[PDB]
Design a protein around this ligand. Structure first.
Ligand SMILES: [Mg+2]
Ligand SMILES: [Zn+2]
Lengths: 108, 214, 293, 166, 152
């Protein structure tokens, strides 16, 4: 089957600018208040999540350096310590992951 | 390695800049500064024996006034005639799409030839002479936008200005002329008239992994 | 005796002349520096105009979101109106409804709603009867209602408003909300507030006690359109912040002599914290219940 | 090709009398040769027509299109040139007056079909144009009321004349 | 018609569906927090909850041993499961995993999700928090709660 006639620009404009084809305005945009950045109400904030991802990427690099090779996952729990504190008396039999920076304020 | 080189008409430096004396505006070694100023006066007299330092300050006042009037009506060839090439862009670029309404009211006291220096021979065969003149006059200014609304100053109100304006001539130039080279504003100068709009200075833009430190 | 119309424009004229006097006292432009020290967009410097610029102007420099969500401003730790001019180079911090401690924002909101209800009462009762406004008690948010004390006519000493009358009050308040007037602020001399409110002995007593509590005898006046009132503190920017509004109940106070003081109670909720129909009905019933200070 | 949008940005006005409205600022910006279709870029521009600048930036940040990211960059640099060179007081006090996409210079490549047949592919390019005007966004036109409809019907009925006679 | 169909059609078949979910479960047990497309995260979340239940059944159980052997493909995570994760959740009953939505993949605009085991050593996610109790609406509802309390 082939077009019997050429569709005009008026019919084309009606089809292409029908409101179903247009982009719907989003109402769920909110200012994430921890960093003042735009987020959607149902998703995580992109800025805060990228912050957490870069920090945990450094954590995982340190874990890999301490592990030293594949197939060596520990049988004990793990805690992360920064510079300037000692491991607490609850973190006795836990693998220590040391980080060379201050503890971030959002990490407790 | 072509024979043709750039024939500069001026420089962009001030030979032994006149440090403004403190309290010169507040109040309504001298032999050494005087003999240097007059050494350069001798050199300029040698390269042109028809210079009167007493006859300079009214010509400097003129060059100032018609330079700012050509700045008023965007008369760029006459700005080149009365204004050095180092003086032109920092006089025209910031007003390229703005309307400047400048006027000269009066002079509070006559301008004073306060400094004369001269360059050395080794500047590509060219010898330049610079003269710093203290100007203390009364002027008006009203800078407008691209859209004709006002930026800075007031239309009619005249205010006092003090300035150490420095002129330069290429003495080795057969067709050289005395043109405005720079202006020395003192480090102790009073603060400028405030602008009529508001400015936000943004803080440090932070990548996510960075932390704000005060 | 002055008619309600003419007392209205004379109060408006006095307010406008005092505002013009302050603007003439600051005739030349002057640059102050404002250090935004908020958690978001930290360490941001504005170079504002002295006694002309507003925290709303700072928010408009930053973004539209700060304009639409910022209800109060902390200027050097003190609550500041969003349309109140800045005097001194300070540090600013915008406060919204959804902060960790929105208590100051709540106090400003409830004071604004009380002053709106007082305006509604004053321009709701008839010309042949007499209305006087005593004060808005600083009632906590936890009580559930804003109270305005009104001295009414001895001809209406026996009269009790009906449900359609309360709904008419609510409709007038919604008309004010739709009209969307800014909350204009004026820090004024106690003398000047006295000739503004000279035809009200209760307003004179309130102005005198505010002048007694502060050393310089400077009180705070607020205006929405034509209604001027003495405030206990800062207010919200615009009446359009209010979304759900109702004048719930009217009560008599216990001492009938020497005069009958009627406490009007209402309840309101902003756009940013609008509630559902059922939750709003329960808040309505609690607001209809008695509130004692 | 033509660059009249940039020349529109370089247009200048005479100084203003002190007794007339303030003539709000106009800022013209464009990006040329975008590897994107002008129709899809039209959908994005028709989305951000008439919005405030921050509303447009929010919508483009949470849209899912390459054109949305490109237009967001263009809007940000237009806002920067607005409050850097055109004396716009507040960076949030702008709205999008004009926002449209045009055709760019494209390229013809072959598309190998079956048999010995072939087609011509078009490496489509497009331009994006934006105009930012200082001030709050204009209010949306309120929908026509029944009072206005009755009024226009009565105006037609009172504009009736006796035709084809004296 | 897919009425009452609880399982998604994923991969190249049921083979590839179970193998994809097994690889996601393995990554989750190893790193304690992974990101993946939303549908895959949902299915793997169900499997992760059941796997922690088997770990709490314990290593001496041969059935739990066989299940962990199948569903963990590196054989060092089986000590990690049976001696780390089950003792971490010996007190909880079924709330072992947390799924949150992360916006969109930067390439094909896929709906993204991050799934973690609760507890952990990693930096915490920016979890969505409810409004503070000192908010205006919350203070009115708290006063209403008090009024009902002294009423009854
Ligand atoms: Mg498939
Ligand atoms: Zn965030």
């Amino acid at each position: 089957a082939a077009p019997k006639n050429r569709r005009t620009i008026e019919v084309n404009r009606c089809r292409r600018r029908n409101p179903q084809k247009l982009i719907k305005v989003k109402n769920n945009i909110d200012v994430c208040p921890e960093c003042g950045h735009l987020k959607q109400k149902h998703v995580l904030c992109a800025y805060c999540y990228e912050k957490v991802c870069k920090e945990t990427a450094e954590i995982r690099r340190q874990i890999g350096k301490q592990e030293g090779g594949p197939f060596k996952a520990p049988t004990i729990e793990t805690v992360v310590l920064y510079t300037g504190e000692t491991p607490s008396e609850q973190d006795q039999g836990k693998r220590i992951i040391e980080r060379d920076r201050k503890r971030p304020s959002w990490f407790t | 390695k072509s024979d043709r080189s750039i024939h500069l008409a001026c420089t962009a430096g001030i030979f032994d800049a006149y440090v403004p004396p403190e309290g010169d505006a507040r109040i309504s070694e001298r032999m050494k500064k005087t003999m240097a100023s007059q050494v350069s006066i001798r050199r300029i007299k040698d390269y042109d024996a028809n210079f009167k330092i007493k006859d300079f300050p009214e010509k400097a006042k003129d060059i100032f006034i018609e330079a700012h009037l050509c700045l008023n009506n965007s008369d760029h060839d006459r700005l080149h005639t009365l204004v050095t090439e180092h003086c032109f862009p920092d006089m025209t670029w910031d007003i390229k799409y703005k309307t400047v309404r400048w006027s000269f009211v009066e002079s509070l006291e006559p301008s004073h030839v306060v400094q004369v220096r001269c360059s050395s021979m080794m500047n590509q065969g060219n010898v330049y002479g610079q003269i710093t003149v203290r100007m203390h006059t009364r002027q008006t200014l009203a800078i407008y936008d691209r859209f004709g609304r006002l930026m800075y100053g007031q239309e009619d109100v005249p205010k006092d200005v003090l300035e150490y304006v420095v002129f330069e001539k290429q003495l080795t130039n057969p067709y050289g002329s005395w043109r405005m080279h720079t202006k020395i504003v003192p480090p102790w100068a009073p603060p400028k008239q405030p602008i009529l709009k508001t400015v936000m200075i943004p803080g440090p833009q932070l990548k996510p992994e960075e932390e704000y430190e005060e | 005796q002055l008619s309600p119309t003419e007392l209205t424009e004379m109060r408006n004229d006095l307010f406008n002349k005092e505002k013009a006097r302050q603007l003439s006292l600051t005739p030349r432009t002057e640059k102050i520096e404002v250090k935004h020290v908020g958690k978001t967009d930290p360490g941001t410097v504005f170079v504002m105009n002295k006694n002309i610029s507003t925290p709303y102007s700072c928010a408009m420099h930053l973004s539209e979101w700060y304009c639409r969500k910022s209800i109060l401003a902390l200027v050097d730790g003190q609550p500041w109106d969003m349309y109140k001019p800045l005097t001194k180079s300070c540090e600013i911090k915008f406060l919204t409804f959804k902060d960790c401690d929105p208590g100051e924002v709540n106090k400003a909101y409830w004071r604004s709603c009380a002053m709106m209800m007082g305006c509604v009462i004053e321009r709701a009762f008839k010309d042949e009867y007499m209305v006087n406004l005593v004060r808005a008690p600083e009632v906590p948010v936890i009580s559930g209602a804003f109270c305005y004390d009104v001295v009414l006519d001895s001809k209406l000493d026996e009269w009790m408003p009906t449900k359609e009358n309360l709904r008419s009050f609510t409709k007038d308040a919604h008309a004010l909300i739709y009209k969307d007037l800014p909350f204009e602020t004026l820090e004024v001399e106690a003398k000047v507030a006295l000739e503004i409110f000279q035809h009200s002995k209760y307003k004179v007593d309130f102005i005198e006690e505010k002048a007694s509590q502060n050393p310089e005898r400077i009180v705070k006046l607020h205006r929405i359109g034509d209604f001027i009132d003495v405030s206990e503190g800062p207010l919200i920017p615009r009446t359009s912040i209010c979304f759900q509004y109702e004048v719930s109940a009217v009560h008599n106070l216990q001492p009938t002599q020497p005069s009958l003081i009627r406490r009007f109670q209402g309840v309101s909720l902003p756009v940013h914290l609008r509630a559902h129909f059922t939750i709003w009905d329960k808040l309505l019933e609690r607001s209809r219940k008695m509130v004692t200070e | 090709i033509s660059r009249k949008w940039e020349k529109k940005n370089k247009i200048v006005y005479p100084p203003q009398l002190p007794g007339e409205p303030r003539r709000p600022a106009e800022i013209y910006h464009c990006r040329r040769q975008i590897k994107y279709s002008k129709d899809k870029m039209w959908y994005l521009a028709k989305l951000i027509r008439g919005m405030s600048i921050d509303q447009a930036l929010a919508q483009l940040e949470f849209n899912d299109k390459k054109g949305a990211k490109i237009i967001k960059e263009v809007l940000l640099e237009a806002q920067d040139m607005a409050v850097r060179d055109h004396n716009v007081e507040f960076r949030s006090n702008l709205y999008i007056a004009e926002s449209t996409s045009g055709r760019g210079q494209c390229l013809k490549r072959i598309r190998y079909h079956g048999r010995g047949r072939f087609g011509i592919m078009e490496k489509v390019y497009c331009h994006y144009f934006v105009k930012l005007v200082e001030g709050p966004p204009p209010p949306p036109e309120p929908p026509k009321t029944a009072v206005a409809h009755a009024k226009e019907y009565i105006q037609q009925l009172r504009s009736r004349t006796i035709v084809h006679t004296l | 018609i897919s009425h009452g169909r609880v399982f998604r059609r994923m991969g190249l078949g049921p083979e590839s569906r179970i193998h994809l979910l097994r690889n996601l479960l393995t990554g989750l047990v190893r790193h304690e927090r992974i990101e993946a497309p939303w549908a895959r995260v949902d299915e793997m979340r169900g499997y992760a909850e059941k796997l922690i239940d088997y770990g709490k059944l314990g290593d001496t159980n041969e059935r739990a041993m066989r299940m962990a052997d199948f569903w963990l493909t590196e054989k060092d995570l089986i000590p990690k499961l049976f001696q780390v994760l089950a003792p971490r959740y010996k007190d909880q009953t079924g709330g072992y995993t947390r799924m949150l939505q992360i916006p969109n993949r930067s390439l094909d605009r896929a709906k993204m999700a991050v799934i973690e085991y609760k507890g952990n050593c990693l930096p915490p996610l920016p979890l969505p928090r409810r409004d503070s109790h000192l908010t205006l609406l919350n203070q009115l509802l708290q006063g209403l709660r008090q009024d009902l309390r002294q009423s009854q």
